[PDB]
Amino acid sequence: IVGGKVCPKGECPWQVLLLVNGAQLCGGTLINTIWVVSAAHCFDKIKNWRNLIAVLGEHDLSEHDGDEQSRRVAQVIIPSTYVPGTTNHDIALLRLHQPVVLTDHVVPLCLPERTFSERTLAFVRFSLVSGWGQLLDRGATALELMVLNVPRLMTQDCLQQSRSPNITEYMFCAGYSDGSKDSCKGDSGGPHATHYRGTWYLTGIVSWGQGCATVGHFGVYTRVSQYIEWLQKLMRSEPRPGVLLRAPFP
Amino acid sequence: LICVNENGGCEQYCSDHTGTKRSCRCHEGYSLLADGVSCTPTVEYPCGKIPILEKRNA
Numbered sequence A: 001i002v003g004g005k006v007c008p009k010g011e012c013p014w015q016v017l018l019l020v021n022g023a024q025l026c027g028g029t030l031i032n033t034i035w036v037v038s039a040a041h042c043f044d045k046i047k048n049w050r051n052l053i054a055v056l057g058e059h060d061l062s063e064h065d066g067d068e069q070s071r072r073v074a075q076v077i078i079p080s081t082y083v084p085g086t087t088n089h090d091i092a093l094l095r096l097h098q099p100v101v102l103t104d105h106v107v108p109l110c111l112p113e114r115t116f117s118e119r120t121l122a123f124v125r126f127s128l129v130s131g132w133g134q135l136l137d138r139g140a141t142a143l144e145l146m147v148l149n150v151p152r153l154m155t156q157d158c159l160q161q162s163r164s165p166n167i168t169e170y171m172f173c174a175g176y177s178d179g180s181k182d183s184c185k186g187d188s189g190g191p192h193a194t195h196y197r198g199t200w201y202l203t204g205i206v207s208w209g210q211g212c213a214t215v216g217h218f219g220v221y222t223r224v225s226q227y228i229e230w231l232q233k234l235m236r237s238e239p240r241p242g243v244l245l246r247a248p249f250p
Numbered sequence B: 001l002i003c004v005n006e007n008g009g010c011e012q013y014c015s016d017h018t019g020t021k022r023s024c025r026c027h028e029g030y031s032l033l034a035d036g037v038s039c040t041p042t043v044e045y046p047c048g049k050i051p052i053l054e055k056r057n058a
């Protein structure tokens, strides 16, 4: 996260850190005790699926304070329509091997109904994006969890205001074009969270694209609303052997 | 009332029905109040609420 601030400990309790062989991979979002939403592209280069760990209740990477909960990842589910090394359909659903325990420091973000998300949430201007990603383009990653308030653009407006992959119906733009504020490498998979009448909801996933905090460009986010029904169906399904599962979309 | 407008007055989720009918609903871990619009937690750690902040104002 570029141009944000430290998320005070416990104020982003749905934030997930994904590790591979102990190394930072990506972010994610807890949506219930065994389910995490992330970005498909995070898994493009994974060799050994068994070395994937999800951490809840994390804050400061430099220390252990006892609020952290680590879990193995049992399943990584990706839509059939996702093509590695690209941007469209950039979403993954992860099943944890064992549930996390909800605490003051570990709480799921609400996965909204599609209609609600489309009719209401989509029109809330500002939303929060978070992660332990790069603090600057070509810079070091953050040791403490960072958060940033970004405004959402209608796709027509995004295109107009921009000056590259297409912006599809499965995406949206948010942020700033002045190169001051953005999500960045290391943040992918993390939440774009939207507040409505006293509760927070999952509306986007930090995806990827061209540079971070590049002048003339906005951040690109996976449009979660397009996937609600897909996610819900999968959450009702039994696990299958072998970590990676490609599931038909729609 | 219609769901497309002002969220049908619902705090959370909204369904249109046949007629001048509307029903509000709530996410798991919440229940609907008698006003037919408001949602109240039923568990300790409902989704989308921040405990240290809920406490901060409790």
Ligand SMILES: Oc1c(-c2cc3cnccc3[nH]2)cnn1-c1ccccc1
Pocket (backbone or CB within 6 Å): A025, A026, A041, A042, A043, A044, A045, A183, A184, A185, A186, A187, A188, A206, A207, A208, A209, A210, A211, A212
């Ligand atoms: O996530 C990324 C990026 C990335 C760039 C960028 C810009 N703006 C926002 C988010 C962003 N993410 C680059 N490489 N990976 C990656 C690839 C393979 C596995 C895990 C990560």
Ligand SMILES: [Ca+2]
Pocket (backbone or CB within 6 Å): A058, A059, A060, A061, A062, A063, A064, A065, A068
């Ligand atoms: Ca820590």
Ligand SMILES: [Cl-]
Pocket (backbone or CB within 6 Å): A236, A237, A238
């Ligand atoms: Cl099944």
Ligand SMILES: [Cl-]
Pocket (backbone or CB within 6 Å): A049, A242, A243, A244
């Ligand atoms: Cl496997």
